[PDB]
Amino acid sequence: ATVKTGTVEEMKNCSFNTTTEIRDKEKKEYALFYKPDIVPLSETNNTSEYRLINCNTSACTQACPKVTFEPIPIHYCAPAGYAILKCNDETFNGTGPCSNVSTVQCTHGIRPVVSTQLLLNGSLAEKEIVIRSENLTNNAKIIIVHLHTPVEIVCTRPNNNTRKSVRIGPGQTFYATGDIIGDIKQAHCNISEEKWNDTLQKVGIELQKHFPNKTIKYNQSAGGDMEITTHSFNCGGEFFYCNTSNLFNGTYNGTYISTNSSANSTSTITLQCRIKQIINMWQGVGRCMYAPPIAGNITCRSNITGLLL
């Protein structure tokens, strides 16, 4: 798009012939694409020839622009002749008897937030950090570390994108990024590294109750695709993929001291984030879709997790 550093070279500028409404007539047309959506065509001398990532697996639908992915809460309800029981007995371990129980015909409002490596906007544990796993003796089992207090995350795409519409055949419009207004700069997320560090102390202390006297070591995800190795969102309608390697770092001993002094400090840990538009949703090839771009710039204030360790 303007050569230079991977902050700008994240965007290719690509052109193609496209079919107008008039079946015999093709028009030359152009768009910007994020590098992961694009793959180099073979059978050429390492040239400027490319294709979309999905043409050799499945034709993805563009998501209709009226459709909104926002996590509006769902209540589940029991049919007639059934009842939903729930625990009032909080700080529950996830199996065995609850001492304080209620019926409800409908659940509280649950948000269908889909993500990885963290949850977001989840309801908090009642009085303390709670650690749940189906069998801690087996490393195959996840450890759901349910938090007591909301650490805040701020995420943004600070490029000022313009949307353009490409007319394809009769009565259809593909949508693509036409231009970036003014400055480049990088998509990223910010967490107050003070509150995060305290939270990794407090998870240290509770996780040590199941692993007594041991020092606790956090680390980055081991490896794989972006979908495995990055945290993920849909802020506004963009499928961010953020590298968490600097976040799950350091090792913390049984001392678990309040190293964050009571005085003011402004240390923010920052995550740099890729973006994609063609997504093979929920590891499905036929589930795949193209998200249309969103004009302007994005900000996305949020409360974090019960960690998926």
Epitope: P158, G182, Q186
Partner: antibody, heavy 125, light 113 residues
Framework: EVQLAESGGGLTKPGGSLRLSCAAS????????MDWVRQTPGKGLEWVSR????????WYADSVRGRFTVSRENAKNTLYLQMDSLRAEDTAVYYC??????????????????WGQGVVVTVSS | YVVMTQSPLSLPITPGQPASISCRSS???????????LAWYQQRPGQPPRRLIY???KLDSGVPDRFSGSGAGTDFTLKISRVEAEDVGVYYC?????????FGQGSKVEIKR
């Protein structure tokens, strides 16, 4: 540090062409807008042109629009102004000055700070 | 467009005395981003301009503390708590809020004798 060095100054006939080179030292030259500003005994100060950090967007004053073009080579820490169709009034002292920063995550307000020591251009042969 | 204008031309003023200069734009210097982008430049005899006061009123790095400033909307001032021999030369206001960036016609500080 942050030091700017203008160079390339000379004499020409009216209607002719000259090129000015500003070389940048002790700052990250990829990360600034850059401006040309010029001085005469009549006017005091006049803005000439602005260029984006990646070289993409460019702006000029009404007095030189289309006649001059501005350019940069971030591989050299270097800015160039190409001047063509030089009028008698373009006879001035030309300065290079550093404008708006564009860091990784954010990009603040407009400036002309610091300034190089300038170069001389004469348009009457 | 933004026209600029400074009120005092010559300042024939004794070393040690306060002085001030006022500059008054044709249109308000407030930018959409919510800062106001005036600055004040000193040119000594035989030198390029350098910037003393900027973002209305902040001192730029290395500037002597005797310089200071104020203002709002279109109207802004540079104040010197005590003028000195090294203050001699021409002062310009300038705006950067709108293209073209534009400059006052100047004011000259001079030793009184």
């Amino acid at each position: 540090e942050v030091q700017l060095a203008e160079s390339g100054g000379g004499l020409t006939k009216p209607g002719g062409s000259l090129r000015l080179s500003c070389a940048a030292s002790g700052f990250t030259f990829s990360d600034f807008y850059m401006d040309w500003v010029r001085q005469t005994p009549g006017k005091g100060l006049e803005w000439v042109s602005r260029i984006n950090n990646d070289g993409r967007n460019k702006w000029y004053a009404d007095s030189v629009r289309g006649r001059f073009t501005v350019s940069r080579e971030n591989a050299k820490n270097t800015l160039y102004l190409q001047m063509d169709s030089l009028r008698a009034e373009d006879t001035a002292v030309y300065y290079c000055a550093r404008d708006r920063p564009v860091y990784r995550y954010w990009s603040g307000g407009y400036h002309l700070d610091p300034w190089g020591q300038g170069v001389v251009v004469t348009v009457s042969s | 467009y933004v026209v600029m204008t400074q009120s005092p031309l010559s300042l024939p003023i004794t070393p040690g005395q306060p002085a001030s200069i006022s500059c008054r734009s044709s249109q308000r210097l407030l930018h959409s981003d919510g800062n106001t982008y005036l600055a004040w430049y000193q040119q000594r005899p035989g030198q390029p301009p350098r910037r003393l006061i900027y973002e209305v009123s902040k001192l730029d790095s290395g500037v002597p503390d005797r310089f200071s400033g104020s203002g709002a909307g279109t109207d802004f001032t540079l104040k010197i708590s005590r003028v000195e021999a090294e203050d001699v030369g021409v002062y310009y206001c300038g705006q950067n809020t709108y293209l073209p960036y534009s400059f006052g016609q100047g004011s000259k500080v001079e030793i009184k004798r």
